[PDB]
Amino acid sequence: MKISDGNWLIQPGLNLIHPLQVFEVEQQDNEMVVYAAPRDVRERTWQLDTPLFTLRFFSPQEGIVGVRIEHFQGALNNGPHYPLNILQDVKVTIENTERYAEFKSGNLSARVSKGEFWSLDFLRNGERITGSQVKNNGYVQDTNNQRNYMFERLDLGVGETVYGLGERFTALVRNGQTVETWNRDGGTSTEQAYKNIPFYMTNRGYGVLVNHPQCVSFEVGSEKVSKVQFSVESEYLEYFVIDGPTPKAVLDRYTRFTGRPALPPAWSFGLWLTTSFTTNYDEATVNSFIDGMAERNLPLHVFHFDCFWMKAFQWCDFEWDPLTFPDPEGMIRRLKAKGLKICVWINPYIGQKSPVFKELQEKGYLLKRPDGSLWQWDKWQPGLAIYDFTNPDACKWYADKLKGLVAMGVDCFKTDFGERIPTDVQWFDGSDPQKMHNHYAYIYNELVWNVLKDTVGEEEAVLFARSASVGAQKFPVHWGGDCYANYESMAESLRGGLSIGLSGFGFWSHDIGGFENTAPAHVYKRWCAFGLLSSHSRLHGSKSYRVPWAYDDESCDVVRFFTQLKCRMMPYLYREAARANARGTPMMRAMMMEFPDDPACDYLDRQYMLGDNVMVAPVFTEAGDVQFYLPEGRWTHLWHNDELDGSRWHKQQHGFLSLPVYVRDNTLLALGNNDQRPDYVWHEGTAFHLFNLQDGHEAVCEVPAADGSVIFTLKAARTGNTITVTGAGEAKNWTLCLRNVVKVNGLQDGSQAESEQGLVVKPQGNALTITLH
Amino acid sequence: MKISDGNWLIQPGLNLIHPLQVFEVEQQDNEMVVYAAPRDVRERTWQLDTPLFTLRFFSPQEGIVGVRIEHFQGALNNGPHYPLNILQDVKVTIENTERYAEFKSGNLSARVSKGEFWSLDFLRNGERITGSQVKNNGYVQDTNNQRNYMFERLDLGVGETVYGLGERFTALVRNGQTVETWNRDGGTSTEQAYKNIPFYMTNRGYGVLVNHPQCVSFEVGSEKVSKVQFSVESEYLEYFVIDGPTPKAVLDRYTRFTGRPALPPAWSFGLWLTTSFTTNYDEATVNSFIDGMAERNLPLHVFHFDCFWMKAFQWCDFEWDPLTFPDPEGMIRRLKAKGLKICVWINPYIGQKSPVFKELQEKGYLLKRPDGSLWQWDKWQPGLAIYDFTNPDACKWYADKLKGLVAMGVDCFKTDFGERIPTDVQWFDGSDPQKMHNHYAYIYNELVWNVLKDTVGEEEAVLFARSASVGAQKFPVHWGGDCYANYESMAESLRGGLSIGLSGFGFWSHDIGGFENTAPAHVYKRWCAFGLLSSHSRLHGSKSYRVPWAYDDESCDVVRFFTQLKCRMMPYLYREAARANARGTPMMRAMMMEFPDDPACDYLDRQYMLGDNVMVAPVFTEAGDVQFYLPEGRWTHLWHNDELDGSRWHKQQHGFLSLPVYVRDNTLLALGNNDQRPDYVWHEGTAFHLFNLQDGHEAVCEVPAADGSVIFTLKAARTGNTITVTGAGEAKNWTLCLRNVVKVNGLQDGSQAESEQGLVVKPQGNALTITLH
Amino acid sequence: MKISDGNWLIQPGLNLIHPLQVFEVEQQDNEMVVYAAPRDVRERTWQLDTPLFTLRFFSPQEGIVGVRIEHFQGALNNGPHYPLNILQDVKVTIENTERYAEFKSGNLSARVSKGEFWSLDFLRNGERITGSQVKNNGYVQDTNNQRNYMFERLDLGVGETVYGLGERFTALVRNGQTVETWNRDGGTSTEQAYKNIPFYMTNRGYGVLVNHPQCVSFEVGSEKVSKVQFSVESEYLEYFVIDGPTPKAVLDRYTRFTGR
C-alpha cells in the first residue's frame, strides 16, 4: 500500500502519526514495554492531548524477538490466529538504561534509543542487522475510505536481497515488487499465488514473520527502495524477527515456531500418474495406462483419479459416477494388488446439482451470508457452496465421507482449491472473515490430514495440496498448481518451488509436462528430468494425458532413465527428507540457501540444490544448451563422472538423457540397489560413492531407516594418502566406490575390483583403510 | 495498470477486445497495414456489428520496426510528440503470403500469422526474439471510470532481464516491478523519478520505445510474469522494436532515432564546486572559498552559484540580489580570471514576490488554468507560477534573460526542477496537458541549450539537468538529484546512473557526499572516489559547509588524489566521451552492457565500467570491505599494478585512498602529463601503458583532440615474443610503459628505462619493436 | 419490466443467462427434473465454470402442469405462499426419450426438446397451445440496482387475446399493456387496481398462474409483441399452465386449485 508520495509528500487523504520519542520503559516479567509519544513530551505541558504507542517486546522461542505495536487496545480483534508455538519461559535479558532499552533473546536483541533521537535497532551480538528509523512505522488514518492501518519499514543494507512470501512465480528476489499475502486461484503466470505466507528472509541471515492472517501488504523495495514496508488494516501490528545467522538456521527457527514439515512415506517419492483433468476415463482407461507402463518397463508407484471420478456439476459430494466406475472398491483393490498406491481428487466446495446439497443446506453445514441464506456463485460449479469448516458437525460429516474412501482402499488425497474464500459472509464460529480467507486453506488441509492420521496412520499420511497458509507446511507436499506446457512456464514454476522452500515448506511437486496445453516432445523430455529430480514427481495434465508414449519413443526412455535414477537415489534423498522434518530445511534449495556466503548465488533461480550434496540445473532449451553456476570446489557429474572447477559459471549442451547433476567434493553418497521402487530396505546392498575427498577432510554418510532415523553411518577421513573408513550401525553387503580413482596402492581389511566409475572396495572386517598412490 | 485478474479472470468493470484473426492485409508504399477482427469474420454474416483493429507496420530507421495499432481514428490526438528522426525512404521488404504477412527492416521483421491462430512475432534473421501472443494486446474499456486504454504484452524468455525506463532507483533489473513514466520530484529513494523514459531493453539484444509522451504504465513481469506489459490511455498504441543484437547496438539505433548525446567540452570534466544550498554568502565569501581550495592544492575548475544569487521567494526572475552581489559581471569576470568556469542556478518557475511576476502575468507568459486565471500553488515557493514555454514570446523573454547572464560571463546553467507540471491547465499552443507533463522537461532544456549554442558556441555548451524526457539526452550531463548521506543511498544513486545510461543518456553527474543529511567522514570519503570516477563530478550538499578539511585532513587528500587522477585520465576519458556522442554508448556502463555474453553480469549494480577498458567498484562499507566480479581475463589495478584472474568474484579491503579500479588485459591506455586541469594538450608528453598484451592480440589507443576526433593512434601487436609498436597521427614526447614488464630481451628503434610499474620505452623511428624474454 | 432493448439489444447493465441445452433428465416419482445449461456442455471441458438451471415439472391437479425453474436454491424464500390446493397423487405420465422429455397431466403436457435446438412446449392432446422459445426465459442479473430476476415469455398465436390479471379498469383485452400485480388504492380510473391476481387466460382455452405473492411484472405483448412476459425478483420462477379447452373449463380448474 502506498503511504508516501515520493520522499517529500504523503498520499492524499492519509494522516500519519509515528512513535518519535520514548516516554517510559517498563519491564513486566520477561517482557519489555515501551511507551512512545508522537511528539516531544519532555515538557509536562505536552504530556496530554496526544496519542501514545505501546510497543511490547517478547520472545516466543530462543532467537525470536516479537514486536507488538499498538494504537487502540479496545478493538474487538477476533480470530482465527496463526498456529504459533509460543513458550512462556524463554530465557531473555532486559536492560533499561539512560540511553537505551534493550530486549534480548539468545543472540538477537531489539534496542530502542531513548531521548530525542528515536530509533529501533535489531542486533545480532551487538551489530545491527536491520531496524526501523524514525517515522518509518506508525498508524495510518485513511480519510478517503475511513480505514485505519499500522505499518513498519525494516531497512535493507547494500546488496541485501529478500526472498519468500510464499510460493510466488515472479522474479525470485523480491526487491522491487509489491506483494499481497492473499490466497487467489490465478494460475502460475501472474503476481497472484495460491500459497501466501507473510514471511520473508534475506541474504543477511534473518527473517521476519508479520503475524496477521488477513491480507498483509508488502512493498519490498517498491515504495522506499532501501526498505521492506508492510501494512495491515488493524489497530495493532505484530511481527517477529527471526535470527540466523544462516538461511537454514532462520528456517529451522521459523519452522520450529510455526510448524515442522511432516516426513512423507517413502512410497510417495515414487512416480505419480494421473487420468488427467477433463480427458476421458473409466477403469479400462486406467488399466490401459497401467498395463502400458508395465509393458514399456516404466516403473509407476501412485495412480491418481482426478475430478470426473464423480458426476459432473456434483463435484465433491463424494459419490462415484456409477456409469464410469460401476465397481469403485473392486477397481481400487485390483490396482493396489499391483503394488500401486491410490489418490483421488477432492476439494472443499459443492455443486447444487448434487443430491447431498439439500441435506447439507438443511443441516447448516454450508457457509452462510449475514442474512442466513447460503453463499453461492457459479464459478467452478453451478450454484457452488462452501463447506463451513468452523462448524464442528460439518467437519465430522466431511471427514466421515473421506473415511469412507479410505475404507475403500484410497491411500491419500489431492486437496485442490480452497483459495477463493469470500469475506461477505458469517462463519459458524463467528471468526473474522478477513482472517478466515487465508486461514481456511490451513483448516481444510488440517482436517484431511487428521482423517489420514486417524486411519492409515501418520507415518502413511501425505497429500497433494494446491493452497496453504502459515503452519500448513505440516501437511506435506504441495504442488505448483496450473502451469503451461512451455519452457518459460517451466522456469516460472521452478521459481515458485524454490520460493516455497524459502517459506518453510519442505516438499514440493509440479505437473511434469505442464498442466494447460500439450507440450512438444522436447519440452516434455526436459520437464521429465526436472520432475524426477524433485522431491515429488507427478505426470498430470489438463486436456491431454501425460503418458510418455503420447509424445514419442525417446520420451519413454527419458522417463525410465530418470525414474530409475530417482529410486536408486532414495538412500540419500530420504535422508535429506528427514532433514526437512527436523530443521525445516527443504529438499529443493535455492543456491543462496546452501551457499549463503557466495555473492554469485544471490539471483540464481534456474538451478538448485537437491539435498545437501547435489546441484541440478534443468535444461530450458530445445537445443539442450544450459548455463549454470558452480560454488567453490571440484564437482563431479553424478553418472558421467566428469569434473568441473567451482566458483564460476559453466556452459554445456545435453541430450535428452542428461542435464547438469553435479556432486560436491568431500561427499560420501549412498546409492541403492533397486531402480524399480522408492520404498525398499536401503541399508542392504547399499552402494557408497566417495567424491573428491580432500586431504584433511572427512565425508560422512547417513543411511536412514524407513522411519527417517539413521540406521547406519559411514565415515571416510583422509589424513595424508591414507583415508580411514569406519561404519556404525546396521548395514549388509555394502560397497565403497572411489569415484574417478583408477588404482590404489594398498588396502587393509578389504578386497578391491576395478569399475568404470572407479575402484570398488569390498569391506573385510573392521578397518577398511586405503592408501592413495 | 492491472488488466487481468490472475490467469483466469479480468479486473472488475473492464471490457476487453483483442485482434484475433487477420481479415485483410494491404501494402501502401513502404508500409504494411493489417486489419484484424476481435472474432472469426470469415463468414459475411459476421462481417458486421464488430470492432476492427487497424495495425500499421513501418520503419523510421534501419533495424527499427514501428507498430501502430488503433481502434478509433476519430479522436483528437493533439501534440506534443517526441522528437523522432523519421526517414521515409528506408529500404524494407513486405511479404504477404497465404500463411503469413511479414514486414522487414534490416535483420528485424514483424510477422503476423493468418488463419485460426493469430500471432505477432518479431524476428531477427528468422529467429523470434519476442512477440505478442493472441489476446495480449488490444483495447481496454474501463467501465468504472469511463476511460479507454490500448495495451500490449511483449514476451520475455527464460533468463531474459529488462533494463532502462529512465533514471530509476529501484533494483536495476526491472523484472517484477511496475513503473509509470511520469516525471515527479520524489527524491532518489523511491519508485518515482525526475527523468522518465518509456524505453526498455533486454539482455537478448533488442529494445522497445513506447511512443507516448503521456503516462505509460509498465508491468514488467509484475502482472504476467513472463511478459512486459504496457498500456496508455488512448485510442491507439504505437511502439518501436529496436534491433541490436548487442546492448550497445540497440542504444546506437535508439540514439540515432531519438537523439545523440552531445559531446561536453573538456573543461566540464573537471571538478565542479558548489557552496551548499542554505549557506549565507556574498562576493568576498565566494573568493575566500575558492582560495581555500587553491590554498590546499585542491584543483577546481567550475564554480556554481546555487539558489541564492537571486533574492529569496523571487526565484527566477533573473535579478541578482542587489545587496549580496552589488556588481555581478565584475565578480564573475574576476572569478573567471582565476581560471574558473561559472555555472548558475535557474528553474522554470517564478514566485509572486518578484516584481517581474506581475509583468509576466500581464503579458500572458505564464501557464493559465482553463478559466484564464494563473495556475499557482505554495510548494517550494509561495504562489509559484510556471513559464508557458509553448508561448513563442514567453520563450523569447526567458531566452534573452539567459543571454544576459552569458554576456555577463556565465558559461553554463543548472536547469533545476521542471517535473511537477500540472495537467488541469491550458497551454498557449493548446497542446495536450497529459503529454506536456513529461515533454515540458525537453522543451525547457532545449530552450536553454540553444541559448548556449547561440552564444558560447555548440562545443562550449553544457548543463546540469535534473529532469528529462525522450530526446533530452542531446543536452548533456544530467544530474542525479538529492541523495542522502549513507551507503544505501550511495548505491541507490549508482543504480540510477547506470539506468539512465541504459536509457540513451551518455553523461551523468551526482553530488559528492550527497544533498541532504550530514554524512560521516568515511561515507564522504568513499563517495569522493565514486564521484570523481564518473563522467561529471561535483562537490556539494545542502546544509554542512562545503569544505573537505572540515571533516579531517584525510578527506582533503582523498579529494586531491582522485581529482588529480581523473585529470590524468582525460586522454582516455575524452575518447570514451566521443563514443557517447557517436554511438550513444554511455561513459558509465553497466557490466551487462560491456559483457553481454557473461551470465555473471546480469544483475551487477554495485560496479560499472568507466569506458571500454576499466572496471570501478566503489566501496560501500566503513571498514573498506568490497566484493566485485571480474569478467574473463587477467586484470591489472590501474595504479597498484596488482593483477587478478577473471571469470570470478573477488573480496578485498581498501583504505580511503583506494578502491577496485581494474584495467582489462590486451589494453593500451593513454595517460596525460597534467594532473591539475582536464583540458590540455593530451597528445603531448602522453604516457601510454600496455596491459597484459597476449600472444596473437593487438591493443589500440586513440588519443583524441579537443573536438573529440582522433589525433593520434598507437597500436601494439604481439606475434610471439615480438610486440610491434606503430603509431599514426600527431604526437610528441610520448612514452610507453610495459606494465609488470621488468626485463625485456631486446628493443628496436627505441631506448628503455626501468620503472616501478614496469619497463618504460621511448620511441625514435616508429619501427619501434620490443621482444619479450 | 423491460429486459430486451428491441429485437437486437439488451437493456444496459443487465446480464442474462438462459437454459439453452438439456444436460440431463431425471424422473422423481410423479415429478420430472430437467437440468439445462446456458451453453453447449456436451464436452467435459465445458462441464465446469458455468451456471446450471434446474427445471422441475409436476402436477397439483388434473390438467394442471407446474413448472419451476430455479437458479440458486440457497435463498431464504420465506412465506406466506398462496392458498393452493395441491394433491400428491395426481396421475401423470413421464416419458424421457432420446429426442424429448415430456410430462403429462390430463390432456396437457409440457415437452422439452433435447439436442441442439432447445424448446419448451405445452401441448393439448399432442398439439401446441403455447410455450417458451430458446432464450425467452432465464435469469436476469441487474447491475444497476444489484437486483436479480427470473423471467418467462409464453407464446401467443395469431389472433390470440389475453384476459384477466385481476379487477383492472384498462381495456378488457390485455394485449399491449404492462401490468404489475401490486394492490394499490388508486381509484377505478387508472392502471392501478385494488384486487391483483397474477392469473391470465386466453381465447385459446388455457390459463396460467404465476405462483408469486410478491409483485409480478407482466408485459402482455408490450415488450415482445407475440408473447406474454412475466418477471419476478426471485431466484426461482414457478407458474402453472391450466388446460381448458374452454374459458369456463379453465376457471373450473383454476378455482378448484385456488378456491371455490
Ligand SMILES: *[C@@H]1O[C@H](F)[C@@H](O)[C@H](O)[C@H]1O
Ligand atoms: C485443481 O483443478 C483441477 F481440477 C485439477 O486438474 C488441477 O490439477 C488442480 O489445479
